């Protein structure tokens, strides 16, 4: 890899600089390099990894949606034929997006997840695995779409099982996992009732645990509870 000659600590330092400069492709390449050093990631380092790739794939998802909308418009009735270009360029962006998802899933599989023993790391990485299979599922149309969806579901489910056994209901990782799994149910699995039930139950159980928290943890947890409520307002 191109980062093989740089010190792990320097890769982490430059990932943080790239974040400040809003250079998220650089940030992701630095954190990929850090992961490939082979040592486990600290909590702060895990969040750098997630932020970097989330911003990269988020730009690609936004672009793919714009191009997909145009492509569907061009396939309507009375729409003038304009050649293969829209499909070609949507396919180009889609392939780049799938490449980023495969890269993240490859890092989790080699070898972040198998080395993660603590609940906070293991749940974090399994949520990530579910997330990036979900982004693959958003663009999937072929014979393996069902298998991609089930890989997202399976990763989210293992993360949920661990989070419910090992973490309090206000834990931000647990909350963010349930938020995203709920959107998986609504958007990918065509199960809006499961999505609503998960979001409501997650919100209610966190509400009842807030009294145990410090002011700073209370702010951390209520921020994500508000996102659960935002989705519930969207959906009901």
């Amino acid at each position: 890899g191109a980062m093989g000659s740089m010190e792990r600590a320097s890769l982490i330092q430059k990932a943080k600089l790239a974040e400040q400069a809003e250079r998220y492709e650089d940030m992701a390449a630095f954190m990929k390099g850090a992961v490939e050093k082979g040592e486990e990631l600290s909590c702060e380092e895990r969040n750098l990894l997630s932020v970097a790739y989330k911003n990269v794939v988020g730009g690609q998802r936004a672009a793919w949606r714009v191009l997909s909308s145009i492509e569907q418009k061009s396939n309507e009735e009375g729409s003038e034929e304009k050649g293969p270009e829209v499909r070609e360029y949507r396919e180009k962006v889609e392939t780049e997006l799938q490449g980023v998802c495969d890269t993240v899933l490859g890092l989790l599989d080699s070898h972040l997840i198998k080395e993660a023993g603590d609940a906070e790391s293991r749940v974090f990485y399994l949520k990530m695995k579910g997330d990036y299979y979900r982004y693959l599922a958003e663009v999937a149309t072929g014979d393996d779409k069902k298998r991609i969806i089930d890989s997202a579901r399976s990763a989210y489910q293992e993360a949920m099982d661990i989070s419910k056994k090992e973490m309090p209901p206000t834990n931000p990782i647990r909350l963010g996992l349930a938020l995203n799994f709920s959107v998986f149910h609504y958007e990918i699995a065509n199960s809006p009732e499961e999505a609503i039930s998960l979001a409501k139950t997650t919100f209610d159980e966190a509400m009842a645990d807030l009294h145990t928290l410090s002011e700073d943890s209370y702010k951390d947890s209520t921020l994500i509870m508000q996102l659960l409520r935002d989705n519930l307002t969207l959906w009901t």
């Binding site: 932020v51 989330k54 988020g58 995203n180 959107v183 935002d230 969207l234």
Partner: peptide, 9 residues
């Protein structure tokens, strides 16, 4: 796209 997931951009 109006649904909220984490991390956010």
């Amino acid at each position: 796209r109006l649904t909220s997931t984490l991390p956010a951009l």
